[PDB]
Amino acid sequence: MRALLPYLALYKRHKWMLSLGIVLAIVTLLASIGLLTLSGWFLSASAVAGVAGLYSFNYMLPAAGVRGAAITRTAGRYFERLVSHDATFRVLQHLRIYTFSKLLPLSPAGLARYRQGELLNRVVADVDTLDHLYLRVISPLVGAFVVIMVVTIGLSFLDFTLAFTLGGIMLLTLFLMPPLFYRAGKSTGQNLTHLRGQYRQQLTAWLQGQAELTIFGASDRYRTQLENTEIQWLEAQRRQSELTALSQAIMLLIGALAVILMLWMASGGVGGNAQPGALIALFVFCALAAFEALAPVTGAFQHLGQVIASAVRISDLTDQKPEVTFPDTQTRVADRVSLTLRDVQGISLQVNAGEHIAILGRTGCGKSTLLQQLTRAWDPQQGEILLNDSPIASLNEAALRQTISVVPQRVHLFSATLRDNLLLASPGSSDEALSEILRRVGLEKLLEDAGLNSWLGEGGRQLSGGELRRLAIARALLHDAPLVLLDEPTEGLDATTESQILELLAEMMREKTVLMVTHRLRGLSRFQQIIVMDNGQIIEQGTHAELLARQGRYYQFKQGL
């Protein structure tokens, strides 16, 4: 329950919309409780008064209470739904903004968790579940508690021993019963999570491995096993309904015990009266209508277990420690950046301004983390990385992100318009200045039919590997940075496209320092100071001709395979 404090403190924003959505729930509940209590007394009082007692009965006061309790109940219900749904969308946005703001400064390192694609589908589903805490848990539980107190306090003016035995019954079933039913089905709700995640484990292994099951004749016996997990799973769901059925029968018996007690106890005297008369129905009808507030409480408390389970998962991620700290000093971005390194994983190299380097590693074995720690994904403990005669750790993020434009190995398509996938690099670029770059990088087929408004990514127009690589270079070309980091370009690309992209770099990154890492020997003659390394150690370096003439390791690379 202490895990929810970071997310109940986000309620300070819109704390009036949230508190209005709970007041309106109480007012609507009290108007319905007071409409049947006033009506029950009116029939009793007017019947004992009779035709003789028509005079001096003063039925205009109840008429203004019948009229008042109906408007506050029909307008309260309409506005309780409006305000509480409006406030649910407002706290969902603030949960989304808070989660993104916390998860971003720890993006590379803090999110290298198992099943990265599945790690983020849980975060989206966990943020959705925190969104339920207000309407599904807080509004019913708080709304029911205040209604029980207002009824008990307001009903104790007539009699104390009758208000405390109806309010006491309602308070016992609000505080005792929701926990007794959450603990009675905590065992059934734990092997129901075990079986749900086991059926998904077996189903994914049955769908992903369908080629290797049909061929080897095991598809039918791995589905019979799958159907047995479902049958076990459908029984744990059955026991979770044998316990929801009981929690609804018992709620009907507690509301039946309050009615029986009010009929019995209040017939022996209300206040000091020997024969209460009309006051008997006031207590009986206040017990019939008062248990409409306690309907959600047993299921509201059950959902609180899932909201807490989500609040500890999100706090596991967002309450981490970022591995990179950015000083807050407003500096200038240089038009020419000379990159220098000194004993960092180590390896040391010099990248003078205006020259194109190429780091040539052995097919992923090196798995160059140089580009990660050069954009400050993690601080380098080995040595120092200097960026234009100033340590890289002393550069403000808004200035570091401007002096380094990296094209990644995994380029992301943001499921938006083709324009929004390129204002990502330079937001202020004009539409015409953005169409020139797209035509200049071989991406002409995109501008065919409403291209700059064409939805990319998830909605449609999925880009091909060669085309999706030309988009990363398009972003780096719009995002003018004096230092460009090419992370394994032209990998998995056909020989026609690879020659077209290496030519794309040489003529458009002409005045920008580049740092290209590859395991391919194509088009390295145009790079001065080629660097060849293995397992994080520089074997040799120099110009393409100088490496060939040296008859070194790079000569062996060009000789056969």
Partner: protein, 586 residues
């Protein structure tokens, strides 16, 4: 012809599976309406005696006893009706999920490959279970919304026809205000649950791309995009919910008016200001409470139908995804009855072959190859040239409209159950679907002798890294074989393919995305096992193909060149271009 009404029309057709369970639940909802009337009549007769006749409570032990039983019987029917409702929804989900898996196993790996396994699990697991509360709680309540209100009026009509007409007067007005705005808002709301699913898919989009937002400085700009997209969704939803929530407000107005009117009519009938509505007999107090205790119970079945709105709203959203899935037409491969006579290496032939995807799209163009018995061919080319489709067709996963003859027998004629017993495939990725590492190797024949299992483990070089595993040959692999790396997971798939002798061996780039040591061990094992039967391999390790006797350089779904490695590496054709592009790797 709105989609909202088409999906609800689909949800009801699935309910005939549990028609017995929905009938029992509809019968118990009628008994609930009878015990509600019995409760109200006993409470009214007790309250009249203690208010009008001033009878002491000790003389009413007969109506109290019958009132307690009416409450105990009410709680028992609620407990029965809540368990019967589950069995209604369980047997519908069990049958729909069986239809989904049948529709998905028949389509085969060709169509399962279209969507990620995470998305298939959403359909089979999350969306099918989203229809439960429609069948378990909504449908049984929409039958209680007409069983009980109509049964209440039948009980108040004999006692007082004016109090029954007050409740019955509101009976047609509630659906009358559903024909004004109910249809308009309900389908508009269905398109707001879609926007809520898109907005949830736009936050996930920004979460999946925080690596790209980090290296461009767009962290603060995408917070404003989340703020604007969220604020956009709320405004358009609150424009519809400003009208959708009129249904709950109006229904809460008629239940207030009816309770008010029953109290005003009876209240002023006792005082003598009214003289109608009673069957020529003085209106009694017990008749007033009967028609007042039953006024909230007239509208309660309707007001609990709004409590279950999300049961319908999230089942219609699940019906949208499942109706289209079961309606998309697919072109399954044509299966037959013919059986291969012999276990000797098969001969492959093709004339104007046209491999086609299930959705009808042609993948590989005209193919005219021929592979004699016992020979080992190679498929080479660029990615997207249709060479991974050719091996799918030979396995029976893709339909075709050409000619693909196995030992002279057409592949459509061959029975898939018996054809694939002469077929071994190693494949691009391991995909170990069993529990342990021993149960993956023994997938082909689980009853293999302990000596024969060691033959496959040693040949595939699985036993060289077995001691590195915590439990050895019985080491579990978990989900996606994460216990062991892809280099040594592929060697498990090799041991599985070499377990039993086959007739045609398919190798779809077995040593791609493998480490240096594992690739060496895999090749040496698949270069020794490719000589034992008819082999056809897709590869890009073009420097090692000197031994293989036939090479098919395939581009754009067409075999554009043929010959051995000796006469292709110097021919200067499309293979020399491919070989040169490979020689630049290191």
């Amino acid at each position: 012809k709105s989609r909202q009404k088409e999906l609800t029309r689909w949800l009801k057709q699935q309910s005939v599976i549990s028609q017995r369970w929905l009938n029992i639940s509809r019968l118990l909802g009628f008994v609930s309406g009878i015990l509600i009337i019995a409760q109200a009549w006993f409470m009214a007769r007790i309250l009249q005696h203690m208010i009008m006749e001033n009878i002491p409570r000790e003389a009413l032990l007969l109506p109290f006893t019958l009132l307690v039983l009416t409450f105990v019987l009410r709680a028992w029917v609620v407990w029965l009706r809540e368990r019967v409702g589950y069995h209604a929804g369980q047997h519908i989900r069990f049958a729909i999920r069986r239809q989904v898996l049948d529709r998905l196993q028949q389509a085969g790996p060709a169509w399962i490959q279209g969507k990620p396994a995470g998305s298939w699990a959403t359909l089979v697991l999350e969306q099918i279970d989203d229809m439960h509360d429609y069948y378990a709680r909504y449908l049984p309540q929409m039958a209680l919304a007409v069983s009980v209100p109509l049964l209440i009026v039948v009980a108040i009509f004999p006692s007082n026809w004016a109090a029954a007409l007050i409740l019955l007067g509101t009976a047609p007005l509630i659906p009358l205000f559903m024909a004004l705005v109910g249809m308009g808002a309900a389908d508009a709301n269905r398109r707001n649950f879609l926007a809520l699913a898109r907005l949830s898919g736009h936050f996930l989009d920004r979460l999946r791309g925080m690596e790209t937002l980090r290296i461009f400085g767009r962290g603060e700009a995408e917070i404003e995009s989340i703020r604007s997209a969220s604020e956009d969704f709320r405004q358009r939803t609150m424009e519809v919910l400003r009208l959708a929530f009129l249904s709950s407000g109006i229904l809460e107005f008629f239940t207030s008016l009816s309770i008010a009117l029953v109290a005003v009519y009876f209240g002023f009938s006792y005082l003598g200001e009214l003289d109608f509505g009673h069957y020529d007999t003085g209106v009694t107090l017990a008749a007033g409470f009967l028609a007042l205790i039953l006024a909230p119970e007239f509208f309660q079945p309707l007001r609990d139908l709004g409590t279950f709105y999300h049961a319908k709203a999230q089942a219609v959203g699940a019906a949208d995804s499942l109706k289209t899935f079961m309606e998309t037409p697919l072109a399954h491969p044509q299966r037959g009855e013919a059986e291969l006579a012999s276990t000797d290496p098969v001969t492959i032939e093709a004339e104007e072959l046209f491999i086609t995807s299930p959705e009808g799209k042609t993948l590989a163009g005209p193919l005219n190859f021929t592979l004699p018995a016992g020979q080992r061919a190679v498929l080479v080319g660029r990615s997207g040239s249709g060479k991974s489709s050719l091996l799918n067709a030979l396995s029976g996963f893709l339909s075709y409209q050409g000619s693909l003859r196995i030992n002279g027998i057409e592949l459509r004629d061959l029975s898939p159950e018996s054809w694939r017993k002469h077929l071994s495939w190693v494949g691009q990725n391991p995909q170990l679907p069993a529990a342990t590492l021993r149960d993956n190797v023994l997938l082909a024949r689980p009853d293999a002798s302990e000596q024969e299992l060691q033959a496959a483990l040693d040949n595939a070089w699985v036993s060289e890294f077995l001691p590195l595993l915590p439990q050895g040959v019985d080491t579990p692999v978990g989900d996606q074989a994460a216990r062991l790396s892809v280099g040594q997971a592929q060697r498990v798939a090799v041991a599985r393919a070499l377990l039993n002798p086959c007739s045609l061996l398919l190798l779809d780039e077995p040593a791609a995305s493998l480490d240096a040591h594992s690739e060496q061990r895999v090749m040496e094992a698949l270069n020794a096992a490719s000589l034992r039967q008819t082999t056809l391999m897709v590869t890009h390790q073009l420097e090692d193909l000197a031994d293989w006797d036939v090479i098919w350089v395939m581009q754009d779904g067409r075999i554009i060149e043929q010959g051995r490695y000796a006469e292709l590496s110097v021919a200067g054709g499309p293979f020399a271009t491919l070989l040169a592009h490979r020689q630049e790797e290191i």
